[PDB]
Write a protein that binds this ligand. Sequence first.
Ligand code: PRO
Ligand code: PRO
Ligand SMILES: [Mg+2]
Ligand SMILES: [Mg+2]
Ligand SMILES: [Mg+2]
Ligand SMILES: [Mg+2]
Ligand code: NA
Ligand SMILES: [O-]
Ligand SMILES: [O-]
Lengths: 484, 484
Amino acid sequence: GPSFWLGNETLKVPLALFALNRQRLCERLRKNPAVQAGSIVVLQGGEETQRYCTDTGVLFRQESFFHWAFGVTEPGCYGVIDVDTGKSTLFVPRLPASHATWMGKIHSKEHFKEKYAVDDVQYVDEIASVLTSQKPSVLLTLRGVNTDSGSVCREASFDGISKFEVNNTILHPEIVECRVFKTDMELEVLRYTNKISSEAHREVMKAVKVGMKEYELESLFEHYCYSRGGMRHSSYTCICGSGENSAVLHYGHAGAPNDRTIQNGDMCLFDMGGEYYCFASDITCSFPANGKFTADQKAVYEAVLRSSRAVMGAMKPGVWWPDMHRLADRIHLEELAHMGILSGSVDAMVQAHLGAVFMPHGLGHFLGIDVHDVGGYPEGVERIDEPGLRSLRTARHLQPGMVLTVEPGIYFIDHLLDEALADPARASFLNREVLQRFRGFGGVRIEEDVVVTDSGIELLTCVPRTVEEIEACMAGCDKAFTPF
Amino acid sequence: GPSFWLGNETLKVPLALFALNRQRLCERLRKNPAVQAGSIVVLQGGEETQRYCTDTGVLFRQESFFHWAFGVTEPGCYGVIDVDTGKSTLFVPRLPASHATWMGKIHSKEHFKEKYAVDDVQYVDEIASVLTSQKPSVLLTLRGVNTDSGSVCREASFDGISKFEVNNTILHPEIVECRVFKTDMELEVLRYTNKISSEAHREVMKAVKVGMKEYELESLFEHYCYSRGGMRHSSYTCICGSGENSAVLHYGHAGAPNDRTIQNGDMCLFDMGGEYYCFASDITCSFPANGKFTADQKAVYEAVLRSSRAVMGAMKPGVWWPDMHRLADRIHLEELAHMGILSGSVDAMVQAHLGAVFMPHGLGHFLGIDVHDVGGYPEGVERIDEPGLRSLRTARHLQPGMVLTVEPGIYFIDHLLDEALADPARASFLNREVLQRFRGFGGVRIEEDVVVTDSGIELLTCVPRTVEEIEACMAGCDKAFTPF
Ligand code: PRO
Ligand code: PRO
Ligand SMILES: [Mg+2]
Ligand SMILES: [Mg+2]
Ligand SMILES: [Mg+2]
Ligand SMILES: [Mg+2]
Ligand code: NA
Ligand SMILES: [O-]
Ligand SMILES: [O-]
């Protein structure tokens, strides 16, 4: 069948991927005792947008649930699925003649049927009429709460929908649960996004020089991903934190826009991942700007390498993700004590939540069509109200087919350190005279993307990770990627 | 005073630029009979957004009127200006402590006052109190219609604004009129955006090879602009049209995403422009993919070069922009006749609006903080209801300080050609025996950015333009060209 492809060495993604997702969704809905025979799933695609009140178009990127179900790149579409038969119908805009002048060929409905391998294609202005002629019992629409943003999913609507029986509660948990478990076809795309992003991270490590601005590496990363990988989008805004900025977790946004000069002696923490056909990657590499770890840098870095590999080595079905977070906390505390930053009983440190002073974020999260993917906190799964753990984006147990980031880190964050030093329950563990040397260090994060398998995990990411590997990579002479 | 700067060789933009815009706006309002003493201009900045219902942040780019007045890069701000004194107050978000962990340093109000060189800084939640203390007569807010998008500008609002007298009609046409006329400080930025984008177009012409995907050059262009120019954004989505795609005026959007393989014998039409600190550039270069113009390609290209230079040579204060559009039309028809594509009386061709078959868009538009800049159709200035001219984005007379694109083109667009051939009023001018050869040619557009001056124009763009210059650049030749 047909495939999405951007030519050259980019990945061919079969449209069968999306057909399988539609089938899986129907199979799950059919087993839900509340779903009536004759139900039709109705999803609304994203629409084109502009900057504010201007005519400056924003590059269109499809809404994630719609993409998961249909793989459609064009704005202004709807898509429906007959639950009982699995039959799919795509609705596309009926375009004006002048589209041919300004925007390009006015493709036929048959072109879109062939392109997307759906059962039928109709025009958007006929959706009420087409759905009426199918005599559905109920329209199943999308509405629920994203547990990372707190936003409510936008429910499909169209002129005449008021004439139908509509249910907006059943679908969201079911399509979310389907998205949590990646098919082998989806895993092929995530292997690819990790491959290109890994290559781009290596090019960045080879290119970094003292004196460069952080954003020069952002630019290079995105150029590699687009020109070589066909990744027009990144999965999230690139985080290119040098020096003390490596302690800022989502550095790089408009308010802190990757605009620091990299200096000799800095650590770099680069968290970047290209997106291909709306599938994510999310990789973080940490390394010395000048290509040689100092003793202090090596110690912090290898502490995080230890937790990274201990967590990956422990992951397998049935493992409770909060236990992995706590494992990483304990290892960090052990290593920081070995370094002399901490003293005392690590058991007592753990009881006082000291780990969260150094790693205030979650160990990792589901990844898929969104970088912070859906389904981390379905009904019955509660957020743990403790330092560190409360920032976990899931408290689920691991099962095969889940895709997770594994991203421990250690940071030296002044307001968290100052709080701890003021608290007698934590201050006694902290050796101020040693810690003072690490003020302004920034931080280290090592982020891998992995798939849970029947027996353990599959690592998708492939970047240098030991101190020796990293130093060798940065010292490499290869003119394998040289823009102008 | 302070400047915006992204280091390296990027442009230092004085914050005095925005202070002058505020002063100019106040001076204009003071002369306006509808404006009373004690008025305060109130603008609301853009807010951070995310993709649909996800927590995937969209990179924040400031709203254009707010940027013009304040130059503020952070989301969530408001800004007010006392009309009688010119005193400026910036309102910034009061951030949660956790911002320090995730987003970066929580800057003081004094930091922002120094950064932006405003008279006062306050937190956004205090805006009702602060304005109440000033006992304004009326708040002047922004509401009007953008004449390119048809959108209504977003008027500022805040909790408690209902307690004030608010006028939302006075400000819009006045701040639009200020934006139409660029200050010398603004011209410095537009010179720079044209310098970087011109350099990037030259790198693209050097790098293009038969067999590449169009998006490879989009990627390279944006990489040059960001890494060398500090341009994180483009001014609009890159149009990288090869072969037949060069006849599609806004090619490159999600529905036609620069995904064609460039073939031997193709023409390329690349319309790309980096944005620096929310100031636009907009440049189009046309050239043969294989670096050598054929006779047919040279003839079409030099026709557009002739109209480009005729218009630039005729532009000066007092010229009616629709007359320049008609001048380009007449030249295109003359040259198409000289090529044998058309025959008969050119006067008669013009009377039949035949020019619009080959150039269905406007000759050019205002450019500034938006690529299609504001103020083309103020009250009293009417759109001309004729082919081609109705697509003009302004029908004003030229005045010093205006910045316009000059972008004639000739395209071979099948549905427009076929319409003409079906029309007895137009059909006899076309020679099918020659025209058939140009079916699928695509098109040529030559786009310069210029400033209207007292004596004529200042050309901002600096790219190769003659056939000889273009062939030399594509063959790798350093500054082998002399601009107009
Ligand atoms: O937001 C999150 O969960 C992770 C933490 C570090 C950056 N991304
Ligand atoms: O939209 C416009 O007015 C011009 C026409 C060609 C591309 N940009
Ligand atoms: Mg990350
Ligand atoms: Mg992550
Ligand atoms: Mg243009
Ligand atoms: Mg233009
Ligand atoms: Na190197
Ligand atoms: O991350
Ligand atoms: O343009």
